[PDB]
Every structure is written in structure tokens, then in C-alpha cells.
Design a protein around this nucleic acid. Structure first.
Lengths: 144, 114, 158, 56, 99, 139
RNA sequence: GCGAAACAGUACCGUGAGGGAAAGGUGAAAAGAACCCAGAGAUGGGAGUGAAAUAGAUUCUGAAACCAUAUGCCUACAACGUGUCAGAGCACAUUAAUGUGUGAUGGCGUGCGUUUUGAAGUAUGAGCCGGCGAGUUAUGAUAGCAAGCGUUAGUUAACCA
RNA sequence: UUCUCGCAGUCAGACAGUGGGGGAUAAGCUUCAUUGUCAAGAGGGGAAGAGCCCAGAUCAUUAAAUAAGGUCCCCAAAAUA
RNA sequence: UUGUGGUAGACGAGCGUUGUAUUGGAGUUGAAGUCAAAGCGUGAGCAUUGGUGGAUCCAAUACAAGUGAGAAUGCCGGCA
């Protein structure tokens, strides 16, 4: 009948990595960010035990959009009060708070499940050039 | 002959209630609710006995693609190199758990190249 | 029935504007008052009629199937008269003939009083006339003791 | 107004989850072999030193 | 070493001294059966099937799986059709599979 | 060793006595009467007398130490209730339900016997299994 | 079962015509618990009778909704018709059975009846639980099936034994 | 799918393509014809749907090849030009 | 080989309870009911075992039905 397909036994092992986005686009960075979060390319994936890794992105300010998306697309956030529509433009976040943009996009990458609230704690993005995460000895790689 | 008919009701209700064990709330004590709960549970079991044979196949394909993207080639290309050339009807769950036996799947990976 | 028990011909509640059900009467089949809608009545026939030819054919067939076995034996006036009113003698008879457990029935044409005086305190033995026995009882015996006289009458009636 | 759907035992239990009685502090009188309250006098009539109420 | 067998229409990998479960093969109990439809033996690859290769194994026991009571109920349309079903299977292990 | 004292149809509600049951549970004999005899509830006062009677029964009849006991389990069992009728507005009566209570308490001597009942349950299921085994060797 | 197995046409509802309740069972025999402890007492625990007191005057059998206490496990970042299919971990071992309880986690997942062109419904019927609660009967007709009798066939009704 | 016979139930339809009427070529409108679905039909796609697009669910299987539709992820699948 | 979606509906094949007619059996060495248990069928259902209980039941074939409960703003009885 069945060969009793093997699932892991919470033998989750993670690694740390550094991805310095210099001239990347938001979507193609986010797709591979989610790929690394869920371990899609890892041979040991099952959705029931969160086989993922750690991702740390540096120099978030330097990510650039394309075309006329800078001044046309609006980002909206809602407060449960009346008329609380915090509406901003791309050039506003890219100067004031840039980590929020990638954070929200990557949180948009992951399924609305009970692991996303644990999947998103695995990403660390910094606006500036220096980070205090130099305690896990990560490996650098680009286009991921 | 006046008929009392007591055993049948008790045995039917007990049999129905026993089926729905480990149920939230009073749904494991009220026969009238227990029968509806077991009806819905068995309907879900009926649909899931196909949904699981589909979802396992989905995870089957996903975990094959996970290993094959590491060799720099496409999963569809691997299925192609199975079918038209070097004819192979090899099992997918076979080649999946041949990831667990290390490097033995790589033999099939290198064999598709004539 | 519904309209035979004594009760109220008046509705306990008005038809509408009441939180309870529509029905008003105290002896419906859905109260604790009796009044079953459908049930037995004291006029049931409980009888079925058969053609006389079929019944006499059944009697003849049962007689034919029971006379062709060694279980039965012929009985005459001799042992009917040799026994007294005492029932013990016929018990010794049955013990000698090992027909105790058998529910043997006596079929007799003469209606002898000596035989019928006994056999009245045993669940196994009873004496009946030829015209009195039916098809059922004749095959309930498992052992037959027939008069020598009844053969001619049975042949005549076929 | 009235409740629409019956509140099961779960609702009543989660509602009574905070209704338990808390213990009242007790103290031992110096010349009274009793377990009396705190800042109070028991049935023998001493707050300690000063007497105040009848023996019983 | 590791091996591969197929039974009915389901495929299985097999390890030595390892058991596995298949549908009833209509075979006696306790004998050694030598299955023919074998595919992809250790470093021996037959593209359609393995040539003159067989896998020998002894059947351990026949059995019945967990009861499955499938009930068909159309929503509010006078339907309560019922059915029961179990699965007659054979549990078996390999001993001496030959190339 | 139980040494329980039963009581039947006290004029009290179940929940109110259940409260002082949680209040009393978990303490020994010395620190039970003191805390029970000061709570301003009429459900606690009857429990004090019942506990005193249970203490006396344990000290007299079963003959344990009587100074190393503690309360083990308190009930609030709805005893046989009573029904009355109450007038209301415009002649719409209602059935007042007078609640009853079957209040019993139990005492323990050892920090154990909470598991001895489980052990007896294991013995019972083991004897059931043994009885099943006996029939299996009748073939 | 007659509305009435018991001091029922009583209790009760009515001014009156009238309408009209519910409930029985210890134990073989009271052998109905002497006496002791707590408490004022009811009573309980004992002792004693008894085969049995888990048969104790609430008195045959004692399950359901209900409400408590307890072993083992789980829950306080969770969008939930609360179940189903995979699923780690935990504590146990059975009507030996690819076993049992619990289910962190992933996929899927808008009840049951009735009426309806149409149901999860912002239509309806049910608070749960246990018991009762509708296709029969009499007399005839039609048609199938089966049986007996059959070439002047077949056939009894009322009625008598 | 014709004939003889036992025995029912149905007499309020909706929807989509198309051919027309009333309506102003306005309806999830009404009223006819024709082909299919639903009533009494689950599945997949269409994100969510009785009718739309694929087809007829006996069951079990952790087994293959396809239909409509898709291949960055959500959500299984692709690229080359 | 052809098929096995399915209400309204036709039609076929079956189970269960009570009682009776017989043929066999169990029963103070412990019946039924009922509690719980990790059994066996396609189904109504049918077993086994331990505790509760101290008098009736079971198997095979037939016959006769006050006969199989989820709803009727139900009715009685108890209880959230």
C-alpha cells in the first residue's frame, strides 16, 4: 500500500546568511527571501515543522524601484478609527523608513498561517550600513 | 401485542455516540448533535481520501524540484529526460526518498545524459 | 379509540396568541390520555377458509406419510380393556414399548371408556375420536397408535 | 433583551473563573488559645494587654 | 542492499530485513514467492524493466486494515445511504533478492 | 483510610458551599478549622461541624494518628431539589426551584492514596484483561 | 390498563353546569439498627442482626441531559460550524490488533430537518435528555403470484354437531 | 423510443448560448421556440457562484497519462526566441 | 462484456422487538437490563469479557403485529 513517507522529527537546523541588496528590485528580492525563509530549495521541506533558515539584509536604503512606480503607487495603512488612512508614497518611505517596505513585502510573501508569525522573526533588515548581528558568523551571497 | 421497544433506541444512540469521541463541547454527549457531527466528519473523510492523494503528490513534486534546482536544471526537463529519452517509469516517491539515501539519486540524475 | 374515552370537548387553550402548541384537547393520541389512533378491535375474524377438497387431501397425505413408518403400531380392544382405571399400568406399558418421551395420541373409533379414564394426567397422551383429530395434531404425535377399525373408515373417507 | 444562543458550561466557567474567596489574615492572641483575626478581638475579650469584652 | 519492487500498481523501496505492506496477492502463507516486475536495482538499470531479475520474499501474514465506514448524505434531500469497507492486505518481508 | 462523614439535604446552594470547598482543600487539620470558622458565609459553618464530626470519627474508630491528616476532597452535590410556585404580575406564575446540597468531606493520613485509587483501577482493568485471556485458552 | 393498582371523581380549578391530577416494589423473616464517638438535634461514622446494610427506611433493577473531584496530555499571537487527512513530542499497554489517550504543527473545511426556481441563512422547526407519539381494521372490487379441484367443472352461506 | 397491462409522481421553473414577442433590443423582467446545466449532480477551473467552461463520483491505494485552465511567490507546474 | 450519481417514485432482496406453536439449550457455578472495554458484517446490527443483579432467558423454523423516532411553536417527567 504505502511506504510510510518520512517526515522530520523536529530536527530543524538553521543557518545564517547576509544578502547585501545593491541594485536589486523589490519583487525579485522578496521572492528569494521567501524562498530562503520556507526552505523551498532545501531537500528536507515539510510544512508541518517550519524547515527554514535565517536571513539578514543590509543597506535597505539602496533598493530601487523601476519605471514610474516611485510617484504613482501608494502604500496604505489603516487605523481602526474613522478616516485613519495613513497614505504614503514610495519616495517617502525610501527616505524616512525603508525597512518597513521590505518587511511588509516579505510578510506579503508568506501564507497567512500560524507559522508566518514565526516565519517573519527570521528576517532582519537594517536601514544603515552596520548591524549588531555579528555573532552568528553568517555567509555572504548575492541575488538571493 | 403492545410493543415497548427500548433496546433498539439505546443501542443505536450508544453506537452513534461512541463514533464521535474526543469532541469539543457537548458534541460527544448529545446523540442528536453527535450524529450530525459524525455525518460531517465522514463527509470530510470522504473528500480528504482524495485531497490527501492529491496533496501528497503536490509535496512529491515540490520536494523533487527542491533537489533538482540545485543541479542547475529544471524539473520539467528531468521528467522530459525520463520520458522521451532513456525511457524511465521510475516512481516519484522512490526518487524522492532516494534523497534520504545520499547521492544514490545522483546516479539517476547522471544517467539521463546518454 | 380517540372518541370513546371520557375527557374534555373544550380546548384547554385558545387557538392563537398562546406560547404553546396549536392543539387543544385533553385525550389526543399525543397526550398521556390513551386514545390510540389504530389498534386491535374486538371484531377480528382471525380465520381463513380452505376448500374442503384441499383439506381432505391434506388429511389423506398426512395419513399416508405417517402410516409408512415403523414408529406407529396397531392397537386393539385388548390392552384397552386389560388395564383398569389405574394409569400406572399404561405407564408400565409405555416403558415396555419405550414411548415415554413421545407425544403419542390415541385415535379410536369405538370411544372406549376404559382407555379414556386413564391418560388424563399426562402431558404426552390424550384420547380422541377419528372425526375429532385434525391434520395438525395427527402429525404432532411423533408416534401413532391406531385402532384396527379405523382403517376401513379412513379408506372410505379417503 | 435576552440571550440568543445558549451559554454552555464553558461560558459560565470562564465567567466564574474569577470569583473565588481569598483567605482572611489570622493572628494568635497572647493569652487566648485561639486563631483569631488580624486587628480584631476574638470571643475571649482581649486585643492583647487591654481587656474589653466579656468572657463569653 | 537497497532494492525496488512494485506490487499491483504501487511501488516500494525495500531494505533487507525490512517489512512492507501490499494488497492481497492471492498467494499461500509461509512460502517464498519470487516477484518478476522489478525496476531499477542497485547500479543496474533496465529502462523498461530489469532484465532476468527477480525479487524473492516470504509473505508474513494476511490482515484487515482499520474499518472505514463511508456514509453518503445529500444535504436536506432525504438521503442517508451508508456503506462499510475494509482492506484485505498482505504483510511481507524480503530475504534473498537476486540480481 | 477515608474516614468520611456524610450529610444529606442541607439548606444551602451548591456553588456557595463549593466555594468554601476550594477554600478548605489543600490544608491539614490544624490549619482547616481556624480558616473555616472565620469565613462570613453560612455554607462554611455547617462544613465546620461536619469536619469536626469527621475528625472525631477518624480519631475514634479507624484509629490513625489524628494529627497528620488533611482534607482530601470536597463536593457540592445537588441533592433532591424542591419546587414551589410564586405569584407574579397579571397571573403569570413561575416555579421557584429550592436547591438542595449533599455535602460530604474526606480525610487522608498520607501524602499518598491519591494514586492508590488509580492502582485499584489498574488492578480492576488487569482482572478484566485476565478474564478475557481465560476465554482465549478455551479453544 | 377504565380518568381511579395507593382511603379518585378524592387533591385542586372554579359561586355553579362542569373541568378534572400525580405517585405501587427494603429485606426470606424488622431480624427497622442495643450500645459508643462527634454534634443541640436531625444525622453520620462505627459496633450488632442479616448471605448481602452499595437492601437502612430517600427503602427492586439505577443508565441521560446535569454538576462536582481525580490520573495523563494540551492551551494564554488566537480569526475557530471547531471536524477531517498527514504530523513531532508526551504518558501508558490492548477484545495483539500495521495498538491506545492526548494533538504542538500543515492542507482542506459556511450544521441537521421542512418548504422551495432555489439553502449556512438576514425565512423557517427543535434548549438538552428519557418514554409515548401515524398506514391498520371490517365489508366488497380490481390485478399479479401461489395453492387445491377440472370436462357438466368448482363452490358453500346462514344454521345444526 | 411500438403494442396489452400493474402502479405512481409531476400541472409555480430558473439559468447560458442563440431565433423572436411585450418593454425604450432595461433588468437576476415577462412571455415562446431550440440546444445543454440545475431541479435530482458531487469534482476541477472561473478567487468567492445551480446554471458559465471541462465530465459523469462503487470503494480502497502516500500509483501513471490527459480535458478546461495555468507555470514568480501566495498555490503544484517553463523555458527558449 | 456492459454498467453501478440520484431525490419525487416503482420494484426486489433482508435485519430487529413482543407474543404463540412446537423441536434443543442455558440459568444461585449467577439471566435480563445497564455501566465501560483497543471486537465481527455491505446495512438495520450481531459477539466476547469484568463490575453492578438476584430471577428468567437463548438458539433454528413459522405465524400475528398497539412494532423500529430528529424535528410536529409538541405532551408528560427531570435537568442546564
Amino acid at each position: 500500500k504505502t511506504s510510510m513517507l518520512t517526515k522530520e522529527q523536529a530536527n530543524k537546523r538553521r543557518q545564517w546568511y547576509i544578502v547585501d541588496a545593491a541594485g536589486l528590485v523589490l519583487g525579485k528580492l522578496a521572492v528569494k527571501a521567501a524562498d530562503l525563509i520556507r526552505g523551498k530549495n532545501k531537500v528536507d521541506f515539510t510544512p508541518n515543522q517550519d524547515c527554514g533558515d535565517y536571513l539578514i539584509i543590509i543597506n535597505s536604503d539602496q533598493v530601487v524601484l523601476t519605471g514610474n512606480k516611485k510617484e504613482n503607487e501608494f502604500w496604505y495603512h489603516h487605523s481602526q478609527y474613522i478616516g485613519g488612512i495613513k497614505k504614503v508614497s514610495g519616495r517617502d518611505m525610501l527616505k524616512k523608513q525603508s525597512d518597513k517596505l521590505v518587511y511588509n513585502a516579505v510578510k506579503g510573501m508568506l501564507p497567512d498561517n500560524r507559522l508566518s508569525r514565526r516565519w517573519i522573526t527570521k528576517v532582519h533588515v537594517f536601514k544603515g550600513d552596520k548591524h549588531n548581528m555579528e555573532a552568528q558568523k553568517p555567509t555572504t551571497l548575492n541575488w538571493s | 401485542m403492545r410493543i415497548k421497544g427500548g433496546k433498539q433506541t439505546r443501542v443505536r444512540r450508544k453506537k452513534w455516540l461512541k463514533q464521535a469521541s474526543g469532541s469539543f463541547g457537548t458534541r460527544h454527549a448529545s446523540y442528536k448533535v453527535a450524529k450530525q457531527t459524525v455525518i460531517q466528519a465522514a463527509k470530510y473523510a470522504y473528500r480528504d481520501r482524495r485531497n490527501k492523494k492529491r496533496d501528497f503528490r503536490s509535496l512529491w513534486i515540490l520536494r523533487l524540484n527542491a533537489a533538482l534546482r540545485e543541479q542547475g536544471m529544471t524539473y520539467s526537463v528531468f521528467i522530459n529526460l525520463l520520458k522521451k529519452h532513456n525511457i524511465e517509469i521510475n516512481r516519484k516517491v522512490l526518487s524522492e526518498l532516494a534523497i534520504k539515501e545520499p547521492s544514490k539519486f545522483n546516479l539517476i540524475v547522471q544517467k539521463v545524459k546518454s | 379509540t380517540k372518541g370513546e374515552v371520557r375527557g374534555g370537548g373544550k380546548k384547554p387553550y385558545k387557538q392563537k396568541h398562546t406560547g404553546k402548541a396549536r392543539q387543544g384537547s385533553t385525550r389526543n393520541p399525543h397526550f398521556v390520555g390513551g386514545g390510540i389512533v389504530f389498534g386491535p378491535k374486538p371484531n377480528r375474524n382471525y380465520s381463513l377458509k380452505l376448500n374442503k377438497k384441499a383439506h381432505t387431501a391434506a388429511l389423506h397425505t398426512v395419513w399416508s406419510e405417517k402410516l409408512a413408518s415403523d414408529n406407529t403400531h396397531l392397537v386393539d380392544q385388548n390392552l384397552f380393556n386389560k388395564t383398569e382405571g389405574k394409569t400406572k399400568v399404561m405407564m408400565q406399558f409405555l416403558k415396555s414399548a419405550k414411548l415415554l418421551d413421545k407425544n403419542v395420541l390415541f385415535v379410536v373409533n369405538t370411544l372406549n371408556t376404559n382407555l379414556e379414564q386413564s391418560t388424563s394426567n399426562i402431558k404426552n397422551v390424550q384420547v380422541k375420536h377419528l372425526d375429532k383429530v385434525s391434520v395438525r395434531d395427527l402429525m404432532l404425535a411423533n408416534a401413532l397408535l391406531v385402532e384396527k377399525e379405523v382403517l376401513k373408515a379412513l379408506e372410505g373417507k379417503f | 433583551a435576552v440571550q440568543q444562543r445558549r451559554s454552555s458550561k464553558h461560558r459560565r466557567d470562564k465567567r466564574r473563573s474569577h470569583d473565588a474567596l481569598t483567605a482572611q489574615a489570622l493572628s494568635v492572641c497572647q493569652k487566648c488559645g485561639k486563631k483569631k483575626l488580624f486587628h480584631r478581638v476574638c470571643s475571649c475579650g482581649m486585643y492583647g494587654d487591654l481587656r474589653v469584652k466579656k468572657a463569653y | 542492499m537497497h532494492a525496488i519492487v512494485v506490487c499491483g500498481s504501487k511501488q516500494y523501496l525495500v531494505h533487507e530485513n525490512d517489512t512492507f505492506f501490499v494488497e492481497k496477492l492471492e498467494a499461500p502463507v509461509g512460502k517464498e514467492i519470487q516477484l518478476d516486475k522489478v525496476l531499477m536495482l542497485d547500479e543496474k538499470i533496465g529502462a523498461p524493466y530489469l532484465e532476468k531479475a527477480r525479487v524473492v520474499c516470504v509473505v508474513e501474514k494476511h490482515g484487515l486494515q482499520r474499518k472505514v465506514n463511508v456514509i453518503k448524505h445529500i444535504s436536506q434531500k432525504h438521503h442517508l445511504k451508508k456503506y462499510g469497507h475494509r482492506q484485505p492486505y498482505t504483510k511481507l518481508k524480503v530475504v534473498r533478492f537476486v540480481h | 483510610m477515608i474516614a468520611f462523614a456524610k450529610q444529606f439535604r442541607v439548606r444551602i446552594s451548591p456553588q456557595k458551599a463549593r466555594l468554601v470547598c476550594q477554600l478548605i482543600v489543600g490544608k491539614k487539620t490544624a490549619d482547616a478549622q481556624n480558616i473555616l470558622s472565620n469565613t462570613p458565609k453560612k455554607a462554611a459553618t455547617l462544613i465546620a461541624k461536619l469536619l469536626n464530626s469527621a475528625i472525631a470519627n477518624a480519631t475514634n474508630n479507624h484509629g490513625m494518628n489524628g494529627d497528620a491528616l488533611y482534607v482530601f476532597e470536597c463536593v457540592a452535590n445537588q441533592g433532591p431539589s424542591m419546587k414551589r410556585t410564586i405569584p407574579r404580575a397579571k397571573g403569570s406564575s413561575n416555579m421557584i426551584t429550592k436547591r438542595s446540597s449533599n455535602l460530604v468531606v474526606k480525610l487522608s493520613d498520607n501524602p499518598n492514596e491519591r494514586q492508590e485509587l488509580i492502582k485499584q483501577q489498574k488492578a480492576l482493568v488487569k482482572k478484566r484483561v485476565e478474564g478475557q485471556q481465560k476465554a482465549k485458552m478455551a479453544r
